[PDB]
Symmetry: C3
Subunit: 341 residues, 3 copies
Amino acid sequence: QVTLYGTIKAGVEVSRVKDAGTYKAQGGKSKTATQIADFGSKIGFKGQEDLGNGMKAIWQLEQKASIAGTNSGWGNRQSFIGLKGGFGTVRAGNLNTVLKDSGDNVNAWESGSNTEDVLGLGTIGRVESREISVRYDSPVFAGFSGSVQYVPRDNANDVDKYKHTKSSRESYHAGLKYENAGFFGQYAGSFAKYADLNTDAERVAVNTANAHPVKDYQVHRVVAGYDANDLYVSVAGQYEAAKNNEVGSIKGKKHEQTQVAATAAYRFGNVTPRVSYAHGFKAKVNGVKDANYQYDQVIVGADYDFSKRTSALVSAGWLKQGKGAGKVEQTASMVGLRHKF
Amino acid sequence: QVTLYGTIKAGVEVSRVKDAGTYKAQGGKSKTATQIADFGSKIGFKGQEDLGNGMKAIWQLEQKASIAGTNSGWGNRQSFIGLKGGFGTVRAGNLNTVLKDSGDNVNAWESGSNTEDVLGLGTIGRVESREISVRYDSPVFAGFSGSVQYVPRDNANDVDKYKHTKSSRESYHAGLKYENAGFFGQYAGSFAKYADLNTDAERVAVNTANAHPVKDYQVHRVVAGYDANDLYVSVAGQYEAAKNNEVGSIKGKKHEQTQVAATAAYRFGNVTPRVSYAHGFKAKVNGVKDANYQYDQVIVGADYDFSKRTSALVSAGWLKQGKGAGKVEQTASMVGLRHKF
Amino acid sequence: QVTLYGTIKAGVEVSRVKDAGTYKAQGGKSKTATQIADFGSKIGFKGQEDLGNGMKAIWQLEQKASIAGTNSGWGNRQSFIGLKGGFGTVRAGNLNTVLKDSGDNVNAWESGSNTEDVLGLGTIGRVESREISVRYDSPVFAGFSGSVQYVPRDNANDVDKYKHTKSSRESYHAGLKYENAGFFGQYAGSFAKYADLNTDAERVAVNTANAHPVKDYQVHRVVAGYDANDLYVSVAGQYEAAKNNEVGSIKGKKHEQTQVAATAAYRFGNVTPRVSYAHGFKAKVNGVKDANYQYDQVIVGADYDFSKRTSALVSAGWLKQGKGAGKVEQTASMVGLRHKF
Ligand SMILES: Nc1ncnc2c1ncn2[C@@H]1O[C@H](COP(=O)(O)OP(=O)(O)NP(=O)(O)O)[C@@H](O)[C@H]1O
Ligand SMILES: Nc1ncnc2c1ncn2[C@@H]1O[C@H](COP(=O)(O)OP(=O)(O)NP(=O)(O)O)[C@@H](O)[C@H]1O
Ligand SMILES: Nc1ncnc2c1ncn2[C@@H]1O[C@H](COP(=O)(O)OP(=O)(O)NP(=O)(O)O)[C@@H](O)[C@H]1O
């Protein structure tokens, strides 16, 4: 007994960008783009066998499958082999980062990738990812459960396996959760002595074009709220920081940014209207306040549940990035459809 | 309840090309190539759930799967999410073009890709394709059923989303069918104010190497015939046309070509012998009759049905393209096997 | 009735290479690499339908699926369509080479690809592969069974289909087996009048960078042993040879190498400890003894069977290649997990 599952979701999204810099049209406004777009359809195959005592062997293979036909490859979404039992769970493979899992309580919007940032809290989710790694998940001991994860230096860099000439990009991810009477609160974070970021502050493979090496990269997230009684309100606080490691005397200088997000919604019969606010404060790059990284976003919308596996979706979102003249404003809205199986 | 399906088909095909131009061997003849070749194996996953009233949510993910191992990717064959009910059907995703669907009644031959043109009416099928799009399919109202399809400018060109600096390649596909007492007749066509063609007259993505931009591109197909009583006879008429839009004073000049095809077959117990004839008339390119596009093809063959899902196949085909000295003649024959699941 | 199956296997492997030449660290020693690594997870879809008499139609689509997410594509592992019945079996598609099948009795170790050579008898398995081809498998006529396989010139080279200007790389693979009272002994080999090798002596596509064309390439394998009674002992002997066909007066000169391998193991309840020894003799390249191709390897390890589909794995291996100063020594060990479904 092996099981097949997935999700299928598509919809048409509408958007426009207000950017003085790369738009020469009147007043910096882009035209308005109207597109049909897959929202991240997926399809997996998980299974489990009982081992005799409390133990169960477990595995999963999940792939991006976009109904627009733009994906390819196996196990490119969470996939793994593991063992489960008294002690809790132990998994190894392409694994959701403890911070990516905590992303559920923080960004629940559906959208195409060209809009993950305006129609979803994509900016705060920029720290989430999947990593080849080992992960331990503790049982829920009465309100509490815990997760510890680790990524090998030689899995975080494969070419450098035999010559340790590049500093380790091995990282540690760990989380602590608490659920009770609708109440929940969790802490999740990650730390890597050495890592590399692109200019959007997302982590990238060592040696990617224009990656900026960093030291002591750490991320902290804290979410809390209440989910039950046709009711949900969630508040998240995130803190990112690292030192400059790139060649040339900027090295040692501090990078850091703080984001906060809040979302609440209620189910009124089959409709669940929702709303989210998110803010990214000014950032300190190489020790200097850089207002290019500051932003504001609010998203509103609802889902009409045709059934427990099928929903109709709608949302509009607004985003403001940076300040003054380098200002970038994005506005989008969509209507789609999701079917879980 | 989600269902798995597909088809598997392979066979060995034999071929030779008579082309004075790119063959220096005696008299323009190529050697004779003998190959094992996948005929387009595929594998999908479709599903549906009832929604409460006459409505049903529907989806599919179908992928090219060639047993020779040369394919990769998900949803690269018709895949989609849709809703079905009283009003008929509504789908969105990688969708068979209304003209690709009408291809069933017009080219039913199985073959490898290196022979889609001699062992199949591939030339008349050059107007068929799949497009990210929305599609409506009307219920059969007593003999009649109808289909309307549309491809967004921003799905027909994604890079140009925000700068509308390139003319829309958005297109409309629509069909009308009629079935009764074995009798059927359908019209199917498509129209795009702006499109782009390669030299084989097939549509290509804006900006492909050597694509020729065109204006008012329209295709018309008409098929009619009789399928029942161990009996099938089909006749198709197709008309393609467009204006020249490419840079440089050839612009505005007319392109056009007409093709006709005919196929008939009968089931004598488990064998179904079949035969097809197809003709492409001289073409008018930039206002001038170009006999390079004219051709003649006849295909004969049969299928021995081992069971309702398994068949053995055989066919020979002959094709003549262009005239005089630029003449290209292709001849092939194959024997294969197909298994539907 | 179509069936889904596969295997999932991952584990962490540890390794170090002692190579004076490409390591400048003290004494030629590399650092020690510690990696999580997929061992070749896979997932297939096979099926069969009865045809009425003793005959059954059969098919399979099997894909590399690595839980680390590094694979993509369909049918890239054995996949095919075939017919089975009184006469035995007939298959066509991506097919395991008769010599790749005989690989079961000769290399049974699990490992990641970066260690297929030290943690597995990978070196002797260098002659195994999959080829688009047709294959016949005779029924077992009381102890004996047989296999004959063939790869078309036009499937072994596709570009050269119409101009036969390159000599045929078409090859023949054939095997003969015998099983009885735990006893078994098989012969398996292949022969190609023209082929091409890389410097590791593995076969490569015509025209690959740095491939060395060869004439009369033939491989001979012979394995024998006893598997039953919680008992296994296997001995293999292999002989490879070819003539030089590359441009420039080295042509016509003899290449040849001999390898032998031996492995035995016993099941003591759920544990099955195992051990293997393998040796590659000096090689004759262009008529000259080349000790660069000579090697020695011993692998020890066991599998603890959690159940008939789940095992825990462990192994260490040691390998010595070439002689004197060009000497390359590899040592690795791993612990992993496998789950068949
Ligand atoms: N690599 C990525 N880059 C950008 N966005 C992503 C990436 N991976 C996932 N996402 C988005 O973030 C979401 C993460 O998954 P989620 O929303 O929890 O649904 P899911 O993956 O089907 N369920 P789960 O298994 O719990 O993750 C996806 O729906 C994507 O829209
Ligand atoms: N992109 C393409 N280019 C060239 N030939 C194609 C392409 N797509 C499909 N074909 C061929 O045309 C046929 C179209 O599908 P068809 O013959 O109807 O079988 P099917 O796809 O299994 N069923 P359906 O879902 O009704 O299309 C395929 O069998 C292919 O041989
Ligand atoms: N192309 C390849 N290159 C290198 N190693 C390979 C290749 N293909 C397979 N292998 C390895 O050799 C083994 C061949 O398959 P095998 O060990 O018999 O397991 P299997 O493929 O699941 N079963 P079978 O269908 O009998 O081959 C795989 O487990 C791989 O580890």
